Ligand SMILES: [Mg+2]
């Protein structure tokens with residue numbers, strides 16, 4: 091009955107002295123949102139809301155000002171590394187309070203396709219250090235790389251090409267003549283002397299000059315885990331100021347990795363330069379960076395369902411396959427493919443739980459992982475058991491009406507036809523429409 | 539027959555770009571040596587040897603030039619943080635090839651007194667980072683502390699007083715008006731969010747943008763040991779240039795400690811400021827600093843013994859208690875106290891091994907430690923068993939003639955008399971002299 095609204099981005103009230111201090115800083119953009127389409131990008135700084143500067147208003151009233159009651163389109167004054175000022179009109183993303191979207195259902199029925207829809211977390215051993223001077227990083231618009239060590243030309247060119255792509259994507263530009271910043275990289279790869287050719291918790295002893303004796307200290311002595319590494323890897327990025335206080339290191343990120351086998355620094359840089367630079371210009375973690383990867387792929391039609399009476403269309407997105415097919419709100423879905431829809435939420439929930447139970451045998455334990463929400467037994471399907479999974483997935487006992495969301499996968503829909511049949515009834519008139527869905531694919535890589 | 543010689547210090551050919559590059563840098567001074575008395579100090583840079591600059595000569599011929607054949611006194615041109623040039627005449631420390639000194643014997647019979655004579659190693663979680671500019675740290679002679687945060691005045695005053703003592707000992711001087719350097723400290727103490735109220739090796743998963751998927755990486759995932767810590771401690775020293783390139787951080791040392799209980803940052807600074815500053819100006823370890831503590835206390839008389847015929851005096855140090863008592867080389871020691879000396883080296887070695895075996899029962903297992911040379915079962919004597927240790931230590935079966943080296947300890951000599959009786963025989967004339975020894979005490983704290 092009441093309509094809920096959202097802005098297509100997540101943000102922080104920045105505590106960083108060098109990037110949009112005590113202002114909203116965008117952390118992530120919601121895919122397929124209006125904020126995305128309007129051109130809002132990660133690490134953007136909200137300077138003003140609807141003409142009022144964010145400094146001239148309390149921190150507690152920023153969420154209300156960003157989601158006004160009467161207004162629908164929020165005018166934003168943005169700053170980033172591309173420009174110091176920019177006007178952006180962000181349209182709101184609204185839905186009915188009782189609407190269940192295909193995005194929500196793709197997440198609820200994710201175990202049909204863990205291969206495409208999951209969340210995972212990881213932590214990187216990055217030490218990120220910035221200048222103690224409260225200089226805004228937005229003052230530096232251009233960069234150049236420091237002189238290449240000819241002994242390592244091949245490697246240094248790969249590293250600098252990775253950093254160049256990351257920084258040009260941020261809105262920074264190369265100027266070899268008079269750069270605002272100089273980029274410097276340092277790296278190391280060699281054997282660990284503390285490796286004993288072997289793979290408990292020890293006490294911490296230190297010398298105390300004040301008492302002229304060795305003493306036990308209540309610190310964790312991790313020195314035994316260090317011995318487990320044969321090799322040591324170091325990789326760092328140094329961003330040196332050339333204009334405000336020349337020679338001052340503005341930002342430095344150093345990765346220190348404990349290695350089991352031999353590893354290539356070029357391969358290491360290719361993977362980690364993009365993860366390391368996610369904290370330039372917005373640094374919030376100094377020692378161990380937490381990341382969250384959320385991936386999702388589903389068949390999109392544009393239909394929203396009633397949270398209570400699920401066989402009822404509550405809305406149809408404006409430029410969607412279901413709209414183009416002629417589906418309209420208040421329609422009643424008789425069936426999707428060969429599966430009836432006149433079931434309760436608990437009928438669907440129980441039937442789904444039965445499917446996961448009865449197909450645990452077709453999962454691959456070599457792929458077992460713990461997802462971001464703490465679930466320990468995530469497994470992909472076994473590649474030699476897809477025909478058996480597809481058959482089990484389509485058993486009427488498991489109420490597979492919503493399995494259409496994953497009809498692009500051969501472990502759900504073996505037939506070479508992603509087009510879904512929707513049998514609707516508006517009043518007493520019964521129609522059958524074939525909806526070829528569009529595939530909504532999305533990956534969000536966010537610093538927690 | 540041939541006399542061996544040494545210089546009273548250990549050194550490196552420095553690989554540091556900011557401190558005596560490709561020149562000898564003194565690491566440690568040998569206590570009671572001529573180099574010590576001449577005023578050679580740790581981290582001194584040998585600029586010239588006997589008038590010849592160390593740059594104008596090969597690295598391979600520096601040890602020979604430092605220990606000449608014909609010459610006995612080596613004239614050194616030194617540089618440090620106190621002065622850019624200084625003339626130092628270092629006398630050599632010589633001994634006969636067949637001489638066994640009381641210093642050597644104190645180390646060989648150390649298990650009489652582990653409490654006073656042992657070696658231990660420890661590693662500190664210090665990250666030490668220096669400027670990539672090859673500026674000599676000797677260009678900066680004065681310092682001042684940066685403005686105190688009034689919210690933490692009590693703590694910041696303790697920290698700065700510790701750093702002030704360390705740097706003034708190095709030869710640096712305070713100048714609040716126009717300092718060459720500004721010292722800045724940063725610190726943090728709070729609970730670990732990753733602590734689960736609990737006290738295996740996990741795989742490393744990271745996101746690879748090049749392949750748009752999570753991947754296993756051959757890196758050690760230590761994230762489980764991080765969870766064991768309730769609290770996190772950070773403590774850092776920042777040395778900022780004010781004259782050459784103002785604002786440039788020359789040297790920075792950051793300690794990151796994983797804590798079991800609550801801990802005071804003032805107490806932490808008091809202990810670690812002296813360990814952290816041992817790498818200013820000579821930094822050779824960037825990430826995990828290895829230290830070695832060598833302590834020794836023995837009764838010194840000045841007598842040197844023959845490695846083969848041990849009851850024969852091969853030398854008597856010039857200003858020693860044995861010299862003052864009238865002991866002279868070629869004398870024959872009949873007995874020390876009530877213990878005869880006419881035994882072989884294996885007679886003494888076996889008798890000593892029997893004593894350690896038979897007194898293992900009087901050791902305190904609560905004190906068990908692994909020494910620097912890798913011995914796992916080092917234990918001090920049990921404080922309630924000293925009378926029994928003293929009796930066992932003086933049993934003629936264990937040939938305790940050399941136990942006089944530890945006669946100042948009540949677990950060896952219960953009587954309140956540190957004066958030792960030496961019964962000698964020169965030719966056929968037999969004399970008894972009472973030697974009150976001097977107590978040689980020494981602690982060496984060195985970066986490995
Ligand atoms: Mg190997």
Ligand SMILES: [Mg+2]
Pocket residue numbers: 768798799800
């Ligand atoms: Mg506790």
